[PDB]
């Protein structure tokens, strides 16, 4: 028929929007995880440096 | 002399009626069958649309 075409297009629109949202969220989650890992790395290097300084003191 | 001509006119016109009756009836019944097939394919789509239009 015809209204089937309209409904199908509406549902394809919804799918497009949902998949776009999912992709954006996944990218941002990846970026935040990288930032957190860098922070932890620098924290541990900070502990190393502080430990060396305390040793020499 | 022209009486027989009138008889021929009547008889030759009458047979055309019989020839055309079958044609009209067959054509009308074929139209009826086509319309019935159209409705048979239409009602299934109607039910699908009943389920389809926003549930």
UniProtKB/Swiss-Prot annotation, chain A:
The modification N-acetylmethionine is found at residue 1. It is found in: Cytoplasm, Cytoskeleton. Residues 1-38 are annotated as: Disordered. Residues 12-38 have a biased composition (Basic and acidic residues). The modification Phosphoserine is found at residue 45. Induction: Induced in stimulated quiescent cells. Binds to actin filaments in muscle and non-muscle cells. Plays a central role, in association with the troponin complex, in the calcium dependent regulation of vertebrate striated muscle contraction. Smooth muscle contraction is regulated by interaction with caldesmon. In non-muscle cells is implicated in stabilizing cytoskeleton actin filaments. The sequences of cardiac and skeletal muscles are identical. Homodimer. Heterodimer of an alpha (TPM1, TPM3 or TPM4) and a beta (TPM2) chain. Interacts with HRG (via the HRR domain); the interaction contributes to the antiangiogenic properties of the histidine/proline-rich region (HRR) of HRG. Interacts (via N-terminus) with LMOD2 (via N-terminus) and TMOD1 (via N-terminus). The molecule is in a coiled coil structure that is formed by 2 polypeptide chains. The sequence exhibits a prominent seven-residues periodicity. Belongs to the tropomyosin family. This is Tropomyosin alpha-1 chain. The gene is Tpm1.
């Amino acid at each position: 028929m015809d209204a089937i075409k309209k409904k199908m297009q509406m549902l394809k629109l919804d799918k497009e929007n949902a998949l776009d949202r999912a992709e954006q969220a996944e990218a941002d989650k990846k970026a935040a995880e990288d930032r957190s890992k860098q922070l932890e790395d620098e924290l541990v290097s900070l502990q190393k440096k502080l430990k060396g300084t305390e040793d020499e003191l | 002399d022209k009486l027989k001509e009138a008889e021929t006119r009547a008889e030759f016109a009458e047979r055309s009626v019989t020839k055309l009756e079958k044609s009209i009836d067959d054509l009308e019944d074929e139209l009826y069958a086509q319309k019935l097939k159209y409705k048979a394919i239409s009602e299934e789509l109607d039910h699908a649309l009943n389920d389809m239009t926003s549930i």
